[PDB]
């Protein structure tokens, strides 16, 4: 029995071993209570404003759109403390952990951004943080690993399975299965078992709320579409949530197409995978024909979650949101274009979203359209990657 519906249509649920169900029910109840609590809301807003730097800017990109009838704005989550939107929801989850009387945080991370985010929130709020990270990811993200440790978190390499994000996800759940009485699991995206998809959307929905107010101020109308990359689905649902009931506003999510969908080396399970049950939820998964879970491939390390949030699968099924994919070369081209024409270095994750906006503009340059791209993070971390390719 739960307070809120754990499903978005057929997708979602609470597919964890029975021993973890009390922890999920406890978290759901704490969340419902926090959402009606003016003191919790004031505390969250204060950290968002005075620690993280909200509200973030909405930047118009006239150099990019010159000569066309596209007007494009970027929502500047690259300017949030930590360099990516993940900071919003780790602060709310840290506060939920304290509300429940927990003193320890467990988190998983792939590219490391979620681990840095979890470590910074835990340092600020006095929580003891341990992070699980696939050993292959530890090897290729030494900078992030060192940032986590400078912030006082313990980083534990995971060598099982493929030694990447999914295996860190498993290990986090194995730990929580034994430590839930003292530790909160600070999950990194809008996926996993209920209530996580719902809590992560609500702790990211200020992205879309601010965007709406900002665009109304600057243009006096809502966007024709809002566009966001989809790794696990958090930045995209945070941008989409406030516009879901605005039927005229398009919601476009962009999964990584890797080397190309036809090559099979991609990370686009929503449109090109198959529904399965893993990580606590029923959702589209990267998996073999026999049901073994597989990795997502992208030039961008952070779009590596091999499934997708159940709310996105639901919005897709009813046709409220549209999902597309962008390849590695398209993302690289968008990264180069933003640097040169606007002086902003975008994360290679966010570059997928910007690449799809550029295609909408270039393919029909005389179509009048007001677009917002969620610039989910900054790309200083990606310059070596981009340098080596080039």
């Amino acid at each position: 029995t739960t307070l809120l519906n754990p499903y978005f249509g057929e997708f979602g649920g609470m597919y964890v071993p029975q021993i973890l169900m009390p922890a999920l029910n406890q978290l759901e109840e704490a969340f419902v209570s926090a959402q009606k609590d003016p003191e919790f809301q004031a505390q969250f807003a204060d950290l968002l404003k005075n620690y993280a730097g909200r509200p973030t800017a909405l930047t118009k990109c006239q150099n990019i759109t010159a000569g066309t009838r596209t007007t494009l704005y970027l929502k500047r989550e690259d300017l949030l403390h930590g360099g990516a939107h993940k900071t919003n929801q780790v602060l709310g989850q840290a506060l939920l952990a304290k509300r429940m009387g927990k003193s320890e945080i467990i988190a998983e991370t792939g590219a490391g951004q979620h681990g840095v985010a979890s470590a910074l929130a835990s340092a600020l709020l006095g929580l003891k943080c341990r992070i699980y990270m696939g050993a292959k990811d530890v090897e290729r993200q030494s900078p992030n690993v060192f940032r986590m440790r400078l912030m006082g978190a313990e980083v534990i390499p995971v060598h099982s399975g493929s030694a990447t994000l999914k295996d860190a996800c498993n290990e986090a759940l194995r730990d929580w299965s034994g430590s839930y009485e003292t530790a909160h699991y600070m999950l990194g995206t809008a996926a996993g078992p209920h209530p996580y998809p719902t809590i992560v959307r609500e702790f990211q929905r200020m992205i879309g709320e601010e965007t709406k107010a900002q665009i109304l101020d600057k243009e006096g109308r809502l966007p024709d579409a809002v566009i966001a990359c989809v790794g696990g689905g958090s930045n995209a649902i945070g941008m989409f949530a406030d516009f879901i009931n605005d039927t005229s506003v398009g919601l476009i999510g962009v999964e990584p197409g890797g080397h190309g969908i036809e090559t099979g080396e991609h990370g686009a399970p929503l449109k090109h995978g198959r529904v399965g049950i893993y990580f606590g939820m029923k959702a589209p998964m990267m998996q073999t024909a026999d049901g073994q879970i597989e990795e997502s491939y992208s030039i961008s390390a952070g779009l590596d979650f091999p499934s997708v949030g159940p709310q996105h699968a639901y919005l897709n099924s009813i046709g409220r949101a549209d999902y597309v994919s962008i390849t590695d070369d398209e993302a690289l081209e968008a990264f180069k274009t933003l640097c040169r024409h606007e002086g902003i270095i975008p994360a290679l994750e966010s570059s997928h979203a910007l690449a799809h906006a550029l295609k909408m503009m270039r393919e029909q340059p005389e179509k009048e359209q007001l677009l917002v791209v969620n610039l989910s993070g900054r790309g200083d971390k990606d310059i070596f990657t981009v340098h080596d390719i080039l």
């Binding site: 029995t1 649920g13 609470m14 597919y15 964890v16 071993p17 029975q18 021993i19 973890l20 169900m21 009390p22 099982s160 399975g161 493929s162 999914k166 295996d167 996800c169 498993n170 759940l173 194995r174 299965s177 034994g178 839930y180 399965g276 049950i277 893993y278 990580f279 606590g280 029923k282 998964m285 998996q287 026999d290 049901g291 073994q292 879970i293 597989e294």
Partner: protein, 267 residues
């Protein structure tokens, strides 16, 4: 069929508990796993609990993570597991065979089709480790349509509503967890389980098999004395495989010695 019911009746007539080993099918290869299983039965196993290799076994500690890695190195697939199961049933007509599965392997090609395949090969029960009672409806319904007992875990943090649900929905046996955490022989449960056991009997639940952390004879006799119908041991068995990979003959001898000892403790 009613293999668990026949077993527990027989055992009750001898005032004995069940001893039930777990292994991962195909660890460390198909042929050796078949030999391992025959040895477990010859040495006194009353029933089997068997895993199908999966990419992400989130209820398992390192010992069983490694069994899965070994099975995957051998190329073991679910279809190969089903062929093994058919062969095990053809050799041994009465022993209860239960699967311990992860959800994605059951849901993959259709939940109903999974249970139908289990009935075709002779499996008696299925525990899906990452399906709690709250999500179990399609799994238990499909199990029952195909004469398969759906098994539920009764955790130490179980409340009364959960005990009633477990007792109502489960068949064959109830999986009584020794403790929180994941599988592993290193970590022994020490909580008193007497109350849960009595409550389950009060609610006419399937007989309880205690599992997680059972690695020694005294823990088998303790489980039976507390009122459980038996005990399951997996990591302890699997560790004997892992330590003897280089000597398959010595591996079977040690498995025999251990299962014999654990089974003697249930009498």
């Amino acid at each position: 069929m009613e293999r668990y019911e026949n077993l527990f009746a027989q055992l009750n007539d001898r005032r004995e508990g069940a001893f039930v080993p777990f292994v991962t099918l195909g660890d460390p290869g198909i042929e050796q796993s078949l030999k391992i299983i025959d040895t477990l039965i010859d040495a006194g196993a009353d029933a089997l609990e068997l895993g199908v290799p999966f990419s992400d076994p989130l209820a398992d500690g390192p010992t069983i993570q490694n069994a899965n890695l070994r099975a995957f190195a051998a190329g073991v697939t679910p279809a190969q597991c089903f062929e093994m199961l058919a062969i095990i049933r053809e050799k041994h007509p009465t022993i209860p065979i239960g699967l311990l599965m992860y959800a994605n392997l059951v849901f993959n090609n259709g939940i109903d089709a999974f249970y139908a395949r289990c009935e075709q090969v002779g499996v008696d029960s299925v525990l899906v480790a990452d399906v709690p009672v709250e999500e179990s409806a399609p799994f238990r319904q499909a199990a029952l349509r195909h004469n398969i007992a759906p098994i539920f875990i009764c955790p130490p943090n179980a409340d009364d509503d959960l005990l009633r649900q477990v007792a109502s929905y489960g068949r064959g046996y109830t999986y009584l967890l020794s403790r929180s955490g994941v599988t592993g022989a290193e970590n022994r449960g020490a909580l008193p389980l007497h109350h849960l056991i009595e409550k389950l009997k009060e609610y006419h639940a399937a007989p309880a098999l205690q599992g997680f952390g059972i690695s020694s004879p005294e823990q088998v006799s303790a489980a039976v004395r507390a009122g459980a119908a038996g005990a399951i041991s997996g990591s302890a068995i699997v560790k004997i495989i892992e330590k003897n990979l280089a000597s398959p003959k010595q591996m079977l001898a040690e498995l025999r010695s251990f299962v014999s000892a654990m089974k003697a403790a249930s009498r």
